[PDB]
């Protein structure tokens, strides 16, 4: 969450959290910037609900598409980049970072996927930069008429509106593996 640099949409990063206590109080509390939507779980009970290997995935996408990072929603971001599982059991935090992630010249670091042969499966990432061919003539290894590079840049700029300004989302997925419980958060601690 407090990281200085954040991953692009095509290479959405993942960080497994395991064998450890997790504090969700720092998150969730003070909810104005966030758009906490806890699909599949109790937002208040995240502290008491124990999962087997909590995962966290972080990317920067325009604020219009924070919605497409939802179970069962179809759009360029979730049919070609990050697809959430129908049985998603994790929250989807998101916030506004125009100041941290934008520059007057226009940040072009973040890139997005506009062409994949078929919709990607749940929690799946493809980082290959290979050309996409819709034409009968083969791609030939160079992007060309009817062949498209899979990564177009996100043109962030400072004066842009709330809808198109950069928003950073950390989709904290949780998995109930038949594995022994690892991420558990309760303490309470009363005096003897």
């Amino acid at each position: 969450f407090n990281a200085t640099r954040f991953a692009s949409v095509y290479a959405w990063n993942r960080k497994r959290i395991s064998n450890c206590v997790a504090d969700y109080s720092v998150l969730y509390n003070l909810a104005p910037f966030f758009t906490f939507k806890c699909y599949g779980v109790s937002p208040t009970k995240l502290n008491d609900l124990c999962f087997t290997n909590v995962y966290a995935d972080s990317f920067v996408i325009r604020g219009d598409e924070v919605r497409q990072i939802a179970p069962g929603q179809t759009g360029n971001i979730a049919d070609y980049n990050y697809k959430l599982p129908d049985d998603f059991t994790g929250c989807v935090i998101a916030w506004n970072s125009n100041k941290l992630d934008s520059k007057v010249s226009g940040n072009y670091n973040y890139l997005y996927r506009l062409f994949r042969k078929s919709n990607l499966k749940p929690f799946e990432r493809d980082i290959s930069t290979e050309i996409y061919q819709a034409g009968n003539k083969p791609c030939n290894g160079v992007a060309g008429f009817n062949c498209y590079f899979p990564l177009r840049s996100y043109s962030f700029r400072p004066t842009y509106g709330v809808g198109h300004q950069p928003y950073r989302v950390v989709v904290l997925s949780f998995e109930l593996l038949h594995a022994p419980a690892t991420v558990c958060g309760p303490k309470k601690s009363t005096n003897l």
Partner: antibody
Amino acid sequence: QVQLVESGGGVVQPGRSLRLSCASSGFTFSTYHMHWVRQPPGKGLEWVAFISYDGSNYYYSDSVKGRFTISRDNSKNTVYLQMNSLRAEDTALYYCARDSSGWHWGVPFDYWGQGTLVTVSS
Amino acid sequence: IVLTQSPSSLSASVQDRVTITCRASQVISNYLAWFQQKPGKAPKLLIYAASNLQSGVPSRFRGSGSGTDFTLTISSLQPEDFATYYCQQYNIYPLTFGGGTKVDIK
């Protein structure tokens, strides 16, 4: 405590230049952003310029564009704005504004400095 | 990008209710802040992000609304609340502030 303290403000003739300073005490200067807000005599708060946490981001209001340069010095705990092309409208009480916007815990424009009077006339 | 405050001046007494409205040219989507400049002092942020009250602001001040129209309502205008409240769009870059309502005593 948080004590951004303005300084360096004094009478300046038109077309000449001046520099101003803020001295944060009690907070980490680098993470928090810095902006400049001027209250013209008998009027309302007006934004001036913005520099980010790194010092890598520069944005200026149309009136101060090309006339004011915003510099952050995280090592010395000081944010300075050096006005260059002074004009009659400049008279004001420039103040320093902290901002934590963008970091998920941000409280926008939370702390404002006392401010130092700035005037312009021959 | 341009904000308007409807009650340019108002008159009130202890325990009275006041509404101040800030409307933007384009939707600012929950990014608005109400400031309270007292006479001869620097401003103090009162509400940020439309409704999330800043810590240290009395509960009597409350703010509401999202999108183009937002408002701030004080159920009791106690003597400490006479000051020129202002609004500002925090995440659009040519940040702009309204003229403000100068609340006054009858």
